Amino acid sequence: VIKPDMKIKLRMEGAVNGHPFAIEGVGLGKPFEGKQSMDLKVKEGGPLPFAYDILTTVFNRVFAKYPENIVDYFKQSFPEGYSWERSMNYEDGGICNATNDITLDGDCYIYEIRFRGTNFPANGPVMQKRTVKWEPSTENLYVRDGVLKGDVMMALSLEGGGHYRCDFKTTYKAKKVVQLPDYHFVDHHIEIKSHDKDYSNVNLHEHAEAHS
Amino acid sequence: VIKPDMKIKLRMEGAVNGHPFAIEGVGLGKPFEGKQSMDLKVKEGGPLPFAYDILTTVFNRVFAKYPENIVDYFKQSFPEGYSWERSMNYEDGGICNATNDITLDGDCYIYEIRFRGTNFPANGPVMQKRTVKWEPSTENLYVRDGVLKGDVMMALSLEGGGHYRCDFKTTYKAKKVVQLPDYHFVDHHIEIKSHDKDYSNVNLHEHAEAHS
Numbered sequence: 001v002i003k004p005d006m007k008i009k010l011r012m013e014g015a016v017n018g019h020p021f022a023i024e025g026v027g028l029g030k031p032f033e034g035k036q037s038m039d040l041k042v043k044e045g046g047p048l049p050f051a052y053d054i055l056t057t058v059f060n061r062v063f064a065k066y067p068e069n070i071v072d073y074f075k076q077s078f079p080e081g082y083s084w085e086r087s088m089n090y091e092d093g094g095i096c097n098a099t100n101d102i103t104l105d106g107d108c109y110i111y112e113i114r115f116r117g118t119n120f121p122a123n124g125p126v127m128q129k130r131t132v133k134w135e136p137s138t139e140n141l142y143v144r145d146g147v148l149k150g151d152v153m154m155a156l157s158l159e160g161g162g163h164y165r166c167d168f169k170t171t172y173k174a175k176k177v178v179q180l181p182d183y184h185f186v187d188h189h190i191e192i193k194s195h196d197k198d199y200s201n202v203n204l205h206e207h208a209e210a211h212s
Numbered sequence: 213v214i215k216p217d218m219k220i221k222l223r224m225e226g227a228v229n230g231h232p233f234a235i236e237g238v239g240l241g242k243p244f245e246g247k248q249s250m251d252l253k254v255k256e257g258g259p260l261p262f263a264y265d266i267l268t269t270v271f272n273r274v275f276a277k278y279p280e281n282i283v284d285y286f287k288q289s290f291p292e293g294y295s296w297e298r299s300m301n302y303e304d305g306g307i308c309n310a311t312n313d314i315t316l317d318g319d320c321y322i323y324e325i326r327f328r329g330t331n332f333p334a335n336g337p338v339m340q341k342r343t344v345k346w347e348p349s350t351e352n353l354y355v356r357d358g359v360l361k362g363d364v365m366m367a368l369s370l371e372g373g374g375h376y377r378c379d380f381k382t383t384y385k386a387k388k389v390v391q392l393p394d395y396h397f398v399d400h401h402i403e404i405k406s407h408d409k410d411y412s413n414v415n416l417h418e419h420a421e422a423h424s
Contacts (some may be wrong), residue, residue, distance in 0.1 A: 135352075135354075135395045136397075136424075137352070138350035138352075138397065140347075140349070140350075140365050140367065142347075142367055142375045142377075143373075143374075143375075144374075144375070151365050151377070152365070153352050153363050153364070153365055155352065155354055155395060157395065161355075162355075162356075163354045163355075163356070163395060165354075165363070167379075183347045183367060183369065183375060185348075185350065212348075
């Protein structure tokens with residue numbers, strides 16, 4: 001029931017280092033081509049006093065190009081959907097955790113999202129908005145305990161060159177019971193194409209292709 | 213001074229969970245094509261009572277295909293060479309550490325290697341030789357503190373399907389002073405093409421291509 005063009009609707013409630021915030025978002029993409037884009041406005045918490053970049057990767061692996069020879073765990077899970085939970089460890093001690101429950105409403109995906117970030121040093125790159133972008137990545141996906149795990153080593157580039165390392169660990173739980181895939185990879189590039197002064201409005205893209 | 217075909221000569225002294233061992237090895241490869249193969253015989257410690265797989269990734273990123281648009285940190289470092297140090301953390305608590313100093317002797321690379329593994333549960337996949345192979349990987353390389361770091365998430369497949377997760381963290385120190393590269397990746401596939409009953413003799417291949 002996956003369609004060539006589908007839309008996205010999402011809200012995130014969160015808090016980073018004690019500062020609460022709420023973001024909502026609208027966008028669309030092509031599930032079979034692995035491309036997507038979305039617009040995101042801050043509803044509460046504005047202006048955010050931390051790097052927006054830490055949030056962007058939380059903003060649905062259904063939007064990945066999956067070759068025929070690989071089982072699409074995500075596209076199979078619909079219309080019932082699936083959820084995922086992710087830990088995010090930054091080398092300077094900051095931790096972020098996030099869940100997203102994903103449901104289908106016609107042709108438009110709905111994300112319910114929760115986000116908690118903490119232990120970011122005050123003088124760190126996240127608290128001082130010194131991040132620039134996520135470098136591209138390759139996520140490693142493998143089956144464990146009947147669900148689907150996703151691990152990836154991430155790096156934010158910083159002001160002056162230089163990189164800020166984060167490790168993502170993700171678990172994907174399909175609602176219904178779906179066919180499980182062998183070990184494979186998903187390349188990612190995520191970009192903020194544009195934004196206003198304090199990232200209250202943000203336009204975000206990500207293309208992703210699975211392979212072996 | 214890098215040549216189309218070059219040879220490898222290597223010795224490793226080590227110990228895993230208290231059991232000492234020594235391995236030597238001869239092989240060759242094509243630096244510019246990222247392919248290599250080697251033969252490895254156990255000299256002391258035979259037969260090894262642990263998974264051979266934990267060793268194989270220690271057995272020279274000069275053997276990677278580097279496109280023109282990317283700085284080859286390794287190929288630049290010669291004939292003086294370079295060394296590297298790697299931590300290897302397995303999810304079941306076992307840790308391995310390893311260094312390799314790499315020198316050129318004519319057309320043949322020489323590896324001096326040290327290896328320490330410990331804290332592997334007795335009933336674990338490494339102590340019970342239940343590993344099958346390393347899944348392919350994508351290593352993320354970035355510059356830090358004037359040297360070159362290399363991080364990669366690895367998985368050993370196991371008996372019965374299922375996977376054993378390890379995180380590699382590697383630092384590469386060139387001897388001389390060489391040009392430093394931007395963030396990039398190196399895909400790896402490493403295979404034991406053949407071996408005798410107890411892995412005393414082993415034939416090992418790895419192809420690797422850098423990209424962006």
